[PDB]
Amino acid sequence: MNRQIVRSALFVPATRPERIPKALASGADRVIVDLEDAVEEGLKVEARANLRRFLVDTPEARVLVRINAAEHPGHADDLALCRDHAGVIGLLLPKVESAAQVRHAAVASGKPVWPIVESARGLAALGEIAAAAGVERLSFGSLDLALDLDLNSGSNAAEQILGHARYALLLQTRLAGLAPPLDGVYPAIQNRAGLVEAVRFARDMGFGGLLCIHPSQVEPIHQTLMPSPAELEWARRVAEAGASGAGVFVVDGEMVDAPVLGRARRLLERAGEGG
Amino acid sequence: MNRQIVRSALFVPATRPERIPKALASGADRVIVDLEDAVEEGLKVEARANLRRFLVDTPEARVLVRINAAEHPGHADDLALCRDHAGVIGLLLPKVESAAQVRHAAVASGKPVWPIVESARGLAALGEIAAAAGVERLSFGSLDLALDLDLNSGSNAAEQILGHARYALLLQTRLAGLAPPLDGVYPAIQNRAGLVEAVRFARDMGFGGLLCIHPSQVEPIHQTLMPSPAELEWARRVAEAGASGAGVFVVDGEMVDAPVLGRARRLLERAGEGG
């Protein structure tokens, strides 16, 4: 699939057809139109039709869709919508607990699957799931695993438990060679100072971006994701001293060996001019 | 077994039978009579006889018993005592390292087993152990595990190791469908401010209660475990706004989706009047 970084994946429910155009103008790397836990049961059918009309009327629009899982009766109608419009470039599979769930949603949709880890069962099967055919990258339901594991969302201890799940998304991402994963949603819409901290914590940990819920969150996320002038100046000074060809040296009073030089070069290239 | 919350399980050694009544009058949700690591080798036979006599003289009493593990020569005598008195409603199995150890303790006692995860070996086999037939809930031997892993008890690094072990107790609890687990003992008897912090950290992470070692600890634990006026006031207001049935709303500047609504309803009902 696409092995590129998604810095922002903005959720917008299909009950809000007028806010899907707003989502795409946010500047979000991806927009997720939702048909599942933001859409009330009675509106799922009408919400699916709202999305179909949006894709039809907007052929150049390319979106991701969080479908309902196989336990739901609308599953197949959700998969058919993902398969039949070119604007659907992938789907979020919620409540994923098996590689077989990934393969069925992938084959029936013909589109790449972003498995969402939202439960204890998901974590335990995550080897299978990340390695399953059709997987592009992983994302995580932070508020969902707090329910499933009985966490007091927002607390020190809760973030420590979530740190273990994040570790598994990050570990399995490398083992299965997936594209960079996206950390969960920061629900305090207007708290940009808290949002900035959750974004920098995620990047420092190896995540590529964040699942967003508001367009106001897009610029804070993308701005916090770019390397600082310092980090780029460090990477430059580290790359400059490894041109000589020395095996090991010191840059900021810190030893620099091959792996550190490799970190500076990947920073210099992933974000700016390489070489 | 019982899928109810045990907020506190108060240890009292079987060498001090005049303290068993005091333990029960504490209000601890469970009292554990100890035959293992608080009874010196030389007093274990007499201590068992103290416990046998207390059970006979106190038919309405219901206690949990921590026996010696199968390596011990008194193992079989401990099991018979747990099997032969109705007042014994379960047994703590220390140093558990295999599902076969749980099964032998459950079949021979005919009572529910509380495994204590006290060793690296226990953790590695915790899948087997938590799924063994007879398991009611897991509990955490924090001081045995510091011994086993050469930890400096009380330190930042040690608690970080203990956090990974706690996660496996919490993960397997959900995977095996067990009753809520108990975090380890807080040994600073009179330091209630530290006890309160350890109790709120454990609850926030998904534990149901604490192993305790003094009756003076019980009220701090049950008082720290009840939802605050604010948390209940929060749950009421998120439940209030999701009554109509809308998919996603905002409560405290924070997004409220189905999983958050589910947390507030479980709080309002798990502790208080539901509906």
Next chain:
Amino acid sequence: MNRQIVRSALFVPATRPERIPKALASGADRVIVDLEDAVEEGLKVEARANLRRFLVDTPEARVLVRINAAEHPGHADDLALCRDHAGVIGLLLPKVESAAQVRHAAVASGKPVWPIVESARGLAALGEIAAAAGVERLSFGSLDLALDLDLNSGSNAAEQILGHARYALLLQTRLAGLAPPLDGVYPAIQNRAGLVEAVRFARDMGFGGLLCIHPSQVEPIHQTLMPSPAELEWARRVAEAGASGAGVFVVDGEMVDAPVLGRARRLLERAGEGG
């Protein structure tokens, strides 16, 4: 192998053979002569010859060698140097990802193996790796792991991930019964206060020592590893109060049972006179 503690293992590259003697006079418990990530490709053959010349010229010297992994063309020549000189008392195997690589390095060198956990693949196979025949102890490549997992070395988040890696080295050490492992390198050569903190965090967590990269790091590490007067005074008083033979008692306002007594006795003996 040796089930003793290595407090410090001082890296020195085989390109600077004049520094190998300095490494030995450092007092480091072990010296590592490097043929991998500090020796540039173009210098590896000559560096191999530098190490051979040092070993022949210094029959009494006892060193560890960090060889190139099996993917490297010099792999077999490196193992041959380890096998043919008595001064080579073990080898560091970098980029370890399978038990079979351990067995090939062990059998071909005939010397004990220190696997370095430097990658996600390594972590996932760490059960196999630690249990393989030939392993003496595990060590941790913190800077390789930051590259492999895209970590911002030095940040709060990266340290949390590395804690998950560290946990698995420590768990697998206990499960496979290996000698005590060594935490990764602290690269800020002159920041002794930061080094001292990295050393104490590692010890509190169960490491026996640290991989080091400069001889000035050796004395800070060895002084920070020794128990403080306070810690020894604590163990003495808990050991003194448990001499009578009581099962449970109070020492510093803290309950003391069998597991706590064992920590106090192990502290007094592992560092000082036992009994």
